[PDB]
């Protein structure tokens, strides 16, 4: 459920790449994953939490 | 700029097809894309935009197919989420590349 998404997110880079709740959630975990990768499993499950928190 | 224009146009069209099929609210992505394309109207950057856009197209097509095949609420939501996430990632990349494109367009 949220665990699955946590595992997909769990899966340094300059070459990387009801409805409103889902969209917003996705947007947030996106932006976070992107800041972390932009620093170029750490803070992966950490990212889903705030994202889940922000959209609910 | 022609390759990028064509690719972004195709992505816009793909997003609308996904909207028609899934009912998802993807119009903000569409508008942001249209606006960025408007800005475009360096070859390395164009390669970046083209491949990113086409890849995103493939993913949106695939996940929309997953929405069509959805047998339940979980499968449906996971697929929608996947569409949203890929479109935001793609838009971040294209926005970044287009801004760099502008910087290069100056000097």
Structural domains for chain B = 1-107 (1.20.5.4130)
What's the distance, Cα to Cα, between the start and end of chain B in Å? 17
Cβ contact, residue pair B24, A19, below 8 Å? yes
User: Which two structure tokens, joined as six digits, stand for B86?
Assistant: 């890929």
Distance from CA of A38 to the nearest CA of B (A): 11
* Residue A52 CA neighbour count, 13 Å, CB half: 11
CA distance B34 to B91: 11
Facing A22 at nearest CB: one of B52, B77, B89? B77
Decide: A55 and A28 in contact? Cβ < 8 Å.
Answer: yes
The 3-state secondary structure of chain A, one letter per residue: CHHHHHHHHHCCCCCCCCHHHHHHHHHHHHHHHHHHHHCCCCCCHHHHHHHHHHHC
Spell A4-39 as b/e; 16+ CB within 10 A means b.
ebbeebeeeeeeeeeeeebbebbbbbbebbbebeee
Its sign, for the CA torsion B83, B84, B86, B91, is positive
Its sign, for the CA torsion B6, B9, B15, B20, is negative
Query: Greatest CA separation found in chain A?
Result: 35
Please tell me which residue of chain B has the smallest CA distance to A37: B89
Spell B9-45 as b/e; 16+ CB within 10 A means b.
eebbebbeebbeebebebeebbebbeebbeebeeeeb
In three-state secondary structure terms, A51 is helix
Resolution value, angstrom units: 2.1
Q: What is the DSSP letter of B70?
A: -
Give the closest residue to B77 by CA, choosing from B3, B36, B24. Answer: B24
Chain-centre distance for alpha carbon A54: 12
A11 touching B, CB under 8 A?
A: no
Give the closest residue to B67 by CA, choosing from B46, B52, B83. Answer: B83
Q: What experiment produced this structure?
A: X-ray
Decide: B27 and B19 in contact? Cβ < 8 Å.
Answer: yes
Decide: B2 and B48 in contact? Cβ < 8 Å.
Answer: no
Q: What is the DSSP string of B21-69?
A: HH----HHHHHHHHHHHHHH--HHHHHHHHHHHHHHHHHHHHHHHHHHT
A20 touching B, CB under 8 A?
A: yes
Give the closest residue to A26 by CA, choosing from B61, B52, B78. Answer: B78
């Amino acid at each position: 459920x949220x665990x699955x998404x946590x595992x997909x997110x769990x899966x340094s880079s300059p070459t990387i790449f009801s409805k409103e709740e889902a969209a917003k959630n996705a947007e947030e975990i996106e932006d976070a994953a992107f800041t972390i990768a932009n620093q170029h499993x750490x803070x992966x499950x950490x990212x889903x939490x705030x994202x889940x928190x922000x959209x609910x | 700029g022609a390759m990028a224009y064509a690719a972004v146009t195709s992505l816009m069209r793909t997003i609308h097809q996904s909207m028609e099929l899934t009912g998802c609210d993807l119009q903000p992505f569409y508008e942001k894309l249209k606006s960025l394309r408007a800005i475009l109207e360096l070859t390395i950057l164009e390669v970046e935009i083209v491949e990113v856009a086409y890849t995103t197209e493939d993913m949106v097509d695939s996940e929309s197919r997953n929405v069509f095949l959805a047998q339940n609420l979980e499968e449906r939501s996971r697929a929608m989420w996947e569409i949203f996430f890929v479109l935001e990632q793609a838009l971040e990349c294209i926005d970044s590349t287009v801004k760099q494109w502008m910087a290069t367009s100056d000097s």
